[PDB]
Ligand binder design. Structure first.
Ligand SMILES: [Mn+2]
Length: 339
């Protein structure tokens, strides 16, 4: 899920009427709920579902319903899809019937049609503080930080009932990776490896908590992955003075896998024992899964690291390290229109 699966062929679920608003109804699409024109689908119908964060280029033939939300973004004219609320009812995504896409009459349920519809991914601007000097590509020997949304995991949420999960708070900052491979120690943003300058915010955070020394102490090819947050980083939800790093993952570069949560929270223990103050994203009570997606979304709303603000949401990592997912707070998305 990195620019991929924004537009997929999916199936209408339960179609509920909107009391008082007769021209439209609410369509369940997997874990999503979506406002449609009345009678546009019956339950069981297939259509293309365009997730929130889809950027769709203007076309009043195909996308007239998006006409008066066209904008300029990367010098591209088109409509960003985002969370909205229609008459007390949450609405996320666009769900159009297959008869609208002639080119897709061969395709099958669940096909990713993003590429072939030319759909791109809207994202917030990267923070002005954090565009440093690029050294290299994000190393290909490290995975980027990424979770599938719970809304897209109905059969897997079923399958996993009874399984236990590390539950962690999702922080609104910027992805940062600090790693060792042999004689090299590097620091990465989301997409790129960075040069150490005096102005580099990520390199500064890594020096300060001594996580570089940490990796020199551990003597392993590891990537420390987490969130840089604070002042002048994405509106500073947590109301920090200055800035800081909070780990949420460690990637084993030799074995080419993440460390399970217990593997991970032990290593952090020893770092803090040897004088390496590496902070971890807030960890909550472990979860035994026996929930709907809808229930998981409800538990995502809650307090953040700063417990006086509403959090971005939660991440769930099965304790064997072989299944993880995120649930973004819909309350958060309602309050935060740049999200
Ligand atoms: Mn984020």
């Amino acid at each position: 899920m990195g620019v991929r699966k924004l537009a997929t062929i999916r199936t209408a679920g339960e179609i509920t009427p909107i009391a008082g608003a007769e021209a439209i109804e609410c369509c369940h699409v997997d874990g999503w709920t979506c406002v449609i024109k009345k009678g546009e689908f019956k339950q069981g119908d297939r259509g293309v579902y365009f997730e929130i964060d889809s950027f769709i280029k203007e076309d009043n033939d195909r996308y007239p319903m998006l006409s008066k939300q066209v904008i300029d973004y990367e010098g591209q004219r088109g409509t960003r899809l985002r969370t909205a609320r229609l008459r007390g009812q949450l609405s996320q995504g666009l769900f159009l019937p297959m008869d609208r896409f002639p080119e897709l009459a061969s395709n099958q349920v669940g096909d990713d049609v993003t590429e072939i519809l030319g759909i791109t991914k809207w994202e917030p601007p990267i923070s002005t503080n954090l565009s440093g000097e690029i050294l290299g590509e994000f190393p290909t020997f490290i995975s980027k930080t990424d979770q599938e949304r719970v809304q897209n995991l109905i059969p897997q949420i079923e399958e996993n009932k009874g399984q236990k999960f590390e539950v962690t708070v999702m922080l609104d900052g910027s992805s940062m990776t600090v790693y060792r491979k042999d004689d090299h120690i590097g620091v990465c943003g989301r997409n790129w490896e960075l040069r150490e300058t005096a102005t580099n915010a990520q390199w500064h955070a890594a020096r300060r908590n001594k996580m570089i020394e940490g990796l020199q102490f551990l003597n392993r090819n590891l990537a420390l992955q987490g969130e840089i947050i604070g002042e002048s980083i994405q509106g500073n939800l947590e109301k920090l003075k200055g800035q800081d790093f909070y780990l949420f993952d460690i990637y084993d570069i030799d074995k080419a896998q993440y460390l399970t949560p217990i593997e991970r929270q032990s290593l952090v223990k020893q770092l803090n024992d040897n004088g390496f103050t590496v902070k971890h994203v807030p960890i909550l009570d472990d979860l035994e899964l026996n929930h709907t997606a809808e229930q998981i979304l409800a538990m995502a709303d809650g307090p953040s690291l700063n417990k006086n603000v509403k959090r971005e949401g939660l991440v769930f990592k099965r304790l064997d390290g072989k299944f993880s997912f995120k649930a973004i707070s819909n309350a958060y998305l309602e309050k935060h229109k740049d999200r």
